[PDB]
From a paper:
Sfm1 is the first SPOUT protein that can catalyze protein arginine methylation.
The crystal structure of a C-terminal truncated Sfm1 (Sfm1ΔC: residues 1−204) in apo form was solved by the single-wavelength anomalous dispersion method at 2.0 Å resolution and refined at 1.9 Å resolution, and the crystal structure of the full-length Sfm1 (residues 1−213) in complex with S-adenosyl-homocysteine (SAH) was determined by the molecular replacement method at 2.5 Å resolution. The adenine moiety of SAH has largely hydrophobic interactions with Pro85 of the L1 loop and Leu133 and Met138 of the L3 loop, and additionally the N6 group of the adenine moiety forms three hydrogen bonds with the main-chain carbonyl groups of Leu133, Gly134 and Lys136 of the L3 loop. The 2'-OH and 3'-OH groups of the ribose moiety form a hydrogen bond with the main-chain carbonyl group of Leu83 of the L1 loop and the main-chain amine group of Gly105 of the L2 loop, respectively. In the SAH-bound Sfm1 structure, the two molecules in the ASU are related by a pseudo two-fold symmetry (about 180°) and the intermolecular interface involves mainly α1, α6 and η1 (or the equivalent loop) of the SPOUT domain in both molecules. Particularly, on the cofactor binding, the β5-α5 or L2 loop, the following α5 helix, and the β1-α1 loop move towards SAH by about 3.0 Å.
Numbering used by the authors:
A (entry chain A): 2 to 204
B (entry chain B): 2 to 171, 176 to 204
Write the structure that this text describes.
């Protein structure tokens, strides 16, 4: 159901924390990590994700069925590409329309590689583009949101968010995260396990 | 979130494969394995389940919040106990009604111990009982079904099942099973070998 195009070279601690959280919230059978470098083997995947059962592949969108027997084929118009630049928000009623939710992004910098657009250009008949509100989200937030709209059938504007949360570490260090986050029951922003400590040590 | 009451002594390969499948399909965040023996420690929990991030506890329903502060409080009427002898079938619109779905069963045998009744009795105000069809399901199938009804909002009679499938190896399973796209019953990874090995 959820397909993440791996958006970096190697795996930083940050992306390991995100992917870990995603895995524990959707379950390993429901996430495919795709488009990894062609040379990638098991020894290249962080063992923390392997233990959690991460399904990964070097293949791309059209080729993933070749790597997984259980995966229903990719039909035209039933694959939703998620893009903050799209004009139509994802709706609860879309639960019927899509069998796959794809996350692209921007790979690297200097130059950057807009994978979202390249996908859009590679799969003109496959992809439908949808937005998750007018603010930028992290991958685990974007997935949590997709899951809230599609599985819990809650419309976007009924979801409680916080934008640009500020985290205070000491009397000196005040950092602000330039993203929208889903609130938890106690009114605080949901981050992956370990993310907070990671942000702290960055200061 | 799903709460599974651990319904056998120790961990057989059978239940390990069943629990693994569940964890991979719903996510380890969304499952609590409860009511384990008081002596139980992490050392007694199978490694394959710990790697997948199994959340387990010796506690029962009343004390589940104590072990996991991230969980929403259990409120009366918002906890559904899944019971094949119950009267009202679980329906898609119940997705707004419940925060928890509990799976009990029989801690047999000689004598057996019906945890389903024990629960239903120890927590009368807490629990509401729902059925998943008139046939018996494995826990992984019952969770799979609860998920289709609650998360995908698919009605029970619109789910495609197979009743009492036979498996030839050169065996009939007395359960109802959900079908996959390929028309075959959906079993936990590794279960077919274990069924075969037993023959
Ligand atoms: N508001 C929004 N609407 C739709 N998708 C969004 C979104 N905010 C984030 N996303 C998803 O999350 C992804 C960005 S997270 C990508 C991080 C990567 N290291 C990079 O540099 O780009 C996007 O590809 C998109 O799929
Ligand atoms: N048709 C049905 N309707 C509602 N719940 C069901 C069901 N079939 C199975 N379940 C639930 O799924 C669980 C798995 S059966 C558990 C196995 C255990 N050895 C025992 O005999 O009890 C059961 O506890 C039951 O409560």
């Amino acid at each position: 159901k959820y397909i993440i195009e791996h958006m970096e070279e190697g795996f930083s601690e940050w992306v390991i924390l995100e992917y870990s959280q995603i895995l524990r919230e959707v379950g390993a059978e429901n996430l495919i990590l795709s488009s990894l470098p062609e040379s990638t083997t098991e020894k290249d995947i962080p063992q923390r994700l392997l233990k959690l059962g991460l399904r990964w592949t070097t293949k791309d969108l059209k080729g993933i069925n070749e790597d997984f027997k259980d995966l229903e084929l990719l039909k035209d118009g039933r694959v939703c590409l998620l893009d903050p630049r799209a004009t139509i928000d994802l709706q609860p009623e879309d639960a019927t329309k899509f069998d796959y939710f794809v996350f692209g992004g921007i790979l690297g910098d200097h130059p950057p590689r807009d994978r979202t657009k390249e996908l859009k250009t590679a799969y003109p008949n496959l992809l439908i583009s949808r937005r998750l509100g007018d603010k930028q989200m992290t991958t685990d937030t974007a997935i949590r949101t997709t899951q809230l709209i599609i599985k819990d059938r809650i419309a976007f504007e009924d979801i409680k968010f916080i934008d640009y949360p500020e985290f205070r570490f000491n009397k000196n260090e005040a950092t602000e995260m330039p993203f929208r986050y889903v609130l938890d029951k106690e009114g605080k922003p949901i981050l992956p396990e370990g993310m907070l400590d990671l942000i702290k040590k960055d200061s």
